[PDB]
Ligand binder design. Structure first.
Ligand SMILES: C[N+](C)(C)CCOP(=O)(O)O
Ligand SMILES: C[N+](C)(C)CCOP(=O)(O)O
Lengths: 346, 348
């Protein structure tokens, strides 16, 4: 809803039935709040217009923030029934199936059955073969890419000049190399990750609101081959952040909402059997050795989540159209980065 | 056989995208050779050494396809990916901006002469029919045909040649008044009914594999695919009976105008296409089946004119921007020769 009637034309030419030759004035489009990278819109036929065929009365329009890998990835997942159906695809975005559901709330990530299912969902997604680069260059390649931008950017507002200067006073480039030493010496398999498994990217499916099999993972924009440790660590960090806050800065950070060791162990107890066929056949002692090594792994890679999304947020404070306290969020990520580095002593 | 000194790019792509033995392969133990047939893209076969054994799942040989010169880069990739997921094409192993790594399928391309074999011809038709009935996440408006012709023409009227013999050849082609002849062509096709379906757009013998140890065939290379008039896909395929791209001396193609399918052979093709595209078909009355076939005969032979015009222009564009060894200017004259020839046969 912004005088961009490209959404109407996209729907008219890409969708079958009633959508073909649907008059401009009879087109219903509204924004869907939530995402911090991409725009999302609902497109619908008027309730009175109801045609016979396979075609949907309601679709989604997603526009990319600021290419091929996300396109091809969405198609493949659509083809495997692992995501929504794909209706249209263009360089600027896509038209996808609207799925009756809602996004999870932050507080729901901690619920045992939810947590268990996300774990299993993530385990099976990690076991997929994808036509992408198998080298784990995403993690530090991305952080170097943002860091270069961060070190270039300047502001005009005195409040923001001060916020950026505090952030840079951590000597971010050295800090990045300390992280690189820590992480490159932490064993964690490269698997297809995714890199953003957040409440807002997990759908509670209506009807299936009973039984495992309640959820769907969506939004594979940041996906790539990566260290598994990152994918789980990033998820754990997401217990601390709630993006539904209504007032500025449009998020809340709660460090004491990070999962306990017992909560992490319950998650990885569902991850492992689903990721490794012969896990449940190991002895209790060998299982616990694996579990303890994994807790060290993911909590170290958790630091890369703070560092990466902290850097991302600073960059977004320049280039993003979305209203969100990006600077305040970057600082929140780095607060958590140093706090957690402290407790680990590494 | 042996690729150009930058076999190195091929090596680096294989090493990075392919799992198992490929990860630990040295540049000195990398096997690769060029495959010569295509006129858009370049193609290579890459292999592990025979002495090298796999660490399980991974392919021992793959195909590297590199895009040629001629938004559509997205559609091309998504299309290959979707077909691989459906088992309507080779598996996708790697995708990157300049091309892809794909399953090497044990097989060979068809020869020009094989297109007329009744069994080969029937299957091509059944195959094309089932592709035509697919739903794809692309634009459903038939803008491809004339959008593409207006595109190649805009460039054709802009290009200028350094060499003198190719200055004469272009001048001759331009003296047909192509901007005006395109509007002639547009008018004729506008009043020709033809179902909009997902079209392959380049169904030649070189994009059809005869599968080893053999339902004998597989349609491949969906680069030009889009929503388009059904008549063009079939019309284009009929034109392909006349053209042989395996000639080994200049201009590296042979045109035989006498090899266009007869009405008998055209009828045999569409008699296989139809029952595979229309659920009702074989139940229909004899009278009604003839009407549909006879209307289809007119439909496809009018759209065959778009095949000659479209590829004639394409071939001129390729004469300034393509790096493949081919007589692009000679090819363009042959297609426009065939266009007026066909325009006469139709009395249009
Ligand atoms: C929220 N985040 C900073 C972890 C990821 C980017 O936002 P989104 O694209 O997942 O909304
Ligand atoms: C052969 N053609 C001229 C009809 C189309 C372009 O060549 P190719 O891309 O199918 O090899």
């Amino acid at each position: 809803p912004r005088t961009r009637r490209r959404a109407y034309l996209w729907c008219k030419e890409f969708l079958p039935g009633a959508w073909r030759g649907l008059r401009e004035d009879e087109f219903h489009i509204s924004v869907i709040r939530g995402g911090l990278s991409n725009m999302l819109f609902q497109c619908s036929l008027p309730d009175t217009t109801a045609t016979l065929g396979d075609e949907p009365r309601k679709v989604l329009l997603r526009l990319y923030g600021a290419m091929v890998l996300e396109s091809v990835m969405f198609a493949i997942l659509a083809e495997r029934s692992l995501g929504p159906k794909l209706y249209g695809i263009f360089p600027q975005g896509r038209l996808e199936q609207f799925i009756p559901s809602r996004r999870l709330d932050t507080e729901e990530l901690s619920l045992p059955d939810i947590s268990a299912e996300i774990a299993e969902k993530m385990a099976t997604f990690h076991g997929m073969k994808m036509p992408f680069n198998k080298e784990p260059k995403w993690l530090f390649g991305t952080m170097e890419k943002y860091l270069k931008e961060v070190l270039r950017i300047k502001f005009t507002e005195e409040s923001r000049i001060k916020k950026l200067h505090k952030l840079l006073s951590y000597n971010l480039p050295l800090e990045l190399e300390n992280l690189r030493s820590l992480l490159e010496s932490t064993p964690s398999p490269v698997v297809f990750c995714h890199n953003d498994c957040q409440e807002g990217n997990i759908l509670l499916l209506e009807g299936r609101e009973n039984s495992k099999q309640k959820l769907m993972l969506i939004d594979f924009e940041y996906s790539s081959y990566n260290y598994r440790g990152f994918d789980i660590g990033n998820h754990f960090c997401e217990w601390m952040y709630d993006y539904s806050y209504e007032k500025y800065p449009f998020f809340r950070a709660n460090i004491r909402k990070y999962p306990t060791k017992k909560q992490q162990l319950h998650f990885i107890s569902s991850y492992l059997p689903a990721f490794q066929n012969d896990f449940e056949n190991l002895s209790t002692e060998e299982k616990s050795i694996i579990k303890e090594e994994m807790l060290l792994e993911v909590n170290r890679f958790a630091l890369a989540s703070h560092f990466l999304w902290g850097l991302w947020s600073i960059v977004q404070a320049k280039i993003s159209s979305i209203e969100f306290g990006y600077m305040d969020y970057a600082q929140a990520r780095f607060d958590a980065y140093f706090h957690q580095k402290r407790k680990l002593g590494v």
